[PDB]
Ligand binder design. Structure first.
Ligand code: HEM
Ligand code: HEM
Lengths: 145, 145
């Protein structure tokens, strides 16, 4: 269940998530847009899903992409803040899962974000240990999709 | 226009917003659910818009309402963090405006949250000065609806 996946994030996984988030979550505009542009660059097939944001090649200058990228980073902030209470983490994961289920985003397609996350972490010198920790948090949302 | 409403957030208004947020933002789950149940109790005609959350009378016990309420408080957190830069505050305001425009929520109906906000601030011993500061930030979202 989502709860099982949540309940299995360990003390050192939560430590790696919090420690990397202190750095990548400090600049939400910069790192949020960096995440979205790496998604569109490496996975060009997803661009069509983001038609509401207009022309995503514009990057930072596209006001709708910048607004979306900041709000996504607050969704991750929320996740990081609920780590010690699985019941609260589960009801916010399920709320964001419904936002993607209505856009017909499958668990497999949602997991395409792991590549971008790994790349943004690597730019701040957080290696594979941290990327693996973040893949465990993404898998909690995948359990809901 | 959003940009003029944004220009109304002067140095003193920004200070009052930050100073009261430091208190109500410390308990996102508690105050978030409090805001929503006060909206439904005082403005019963709005409950129909929230049919996805099921029985909102249950409050904190209703997992969908709790998930919704925590996320709403991170939208407010987001607005407070963008007060330094009006261009970033306006693109996140417009993102949340579209979430309500699709739900057929008018500027007048969105304004019904001011009663709830004043009551929650009042229980924390933040009076009308602070309620009026928050009404000015709510007016930026109203301007985009
Ligand atoms: C770390 C992972 C992710 C998080 C936390 C996340 C978060 C968000 C948030 C908060 C929204 C706004 C929801 C709304 O207001 O309706 C959103 C929208 C969306 N997301 Fe994600 N998302 C993630 C990954 C993905 C991935 C990998 C895809 C697709 C392959 C995806 C596709 C979408 C789509 C299509 C929208 C709607 C865009 C629009 O029209 O505004 N998301 N996402
Ligand atoms: C401080 C003011 C408010 C803020 C920051 C706010 C924020 C939000 C956020 C972040 C969402 C989630 C969007 C999504 O994922 O689709 C939401 C949903 C919603 N809001 Fe608000 N909101 C506010 C006031 C109101 C008011 C006063 C009304 C109506 C009288 C309203 C009606 C709705 C509705 C109908 C939904 C959809 C609930 C659902 O089915 O999931 N909001 N709001």
């Amino acid at each position: 269940s989502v709860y099982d996946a949540a309940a299995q994030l360990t003390a050192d996984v939560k430590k790696d998530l919090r420690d990397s988030w202190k750095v990548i979550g400090s600049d939400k505009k910069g790192n949020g847009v960096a995440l979205m542009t790496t998604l569109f660059a490496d996975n060009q097939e997803t661009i069509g899903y983001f038609k509401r944001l207009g022309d995503v090649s514009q990057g930072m200058a596209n006001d709708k992409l910048r607004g979306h990228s900041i709000v996504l980073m607050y969704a991750l902030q929320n996740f990081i803040d609920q780590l010690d209470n699985p019941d609260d983490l589960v009801c916010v994961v399920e709320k964001f899962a419904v936002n993607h289920i209505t856009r017909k985003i499958s668990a497999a397609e949602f997991g395409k974000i792991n590549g971008p996350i790994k790349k943004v972490l690597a730019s701040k010198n957080f290696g594979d240990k941290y990327a693996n920790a973040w893949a465990k948090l993404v898998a909690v949302v995948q359990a809901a999709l």
